[PDB]
Amino acid sequence: MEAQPQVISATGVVKGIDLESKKITIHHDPIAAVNWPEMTMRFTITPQTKMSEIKTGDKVAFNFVQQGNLSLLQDIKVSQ
Ligand SMILES: [Ag+]
């Protein structure tokens, strides 16, 4: 609804992943929607994040929302 954050799409390379602590670090390409340059950033897996098999070193396509100080993944998959 109205106050909820918008869904941001991006692409990048997985630098590391820890399913136990719900952490994925992604070196992503620029994101115009939030005025971010190419960056490495901490993303957060939630129980709702729609995942496929992801491993360190994979190129990925993903969507997230910014909710306070966390970047919450909505979905992630390997990409070309
Ligand atoms: Ag970022």
From Swiss-Prot:
GO terms for molecular function: copper chaperone activity; copper ion binding; metallochaperone activity; transition metal ion binding. Keywords: Copper, Metal-binding, Periplasm, Signal. GO terms for biological process: copper ion export; copper ion transmembrane transport; detoxification of copper ion; intracellular copper ion homeostasis; response to copper ion; response to silver ion; response to toxic substance; response to zinc ion. It is found in: Periplasm. Induction: Transcriptionally regulated by CusR in response to copper and silver ions. GO terms for cellular component: outer membrane-bounded periplasmic space; periplasmic space. It comes from the Bacteria. The cus system plays an important role in copper tolerance under anaerobic growth and, under extreme copper stress, in aerobic growth. Part of a cation efflux system that mediates resistance to copper and silver. Binds one copper per polypeptide. The cus efflux system is composed of CusA, CusB, CusC and CusF. Interacts with copper-exporting P-type ATPase CopA; when this protein is precharged with copper it binds very little CopA. This is Cation efflux system protein CusF.
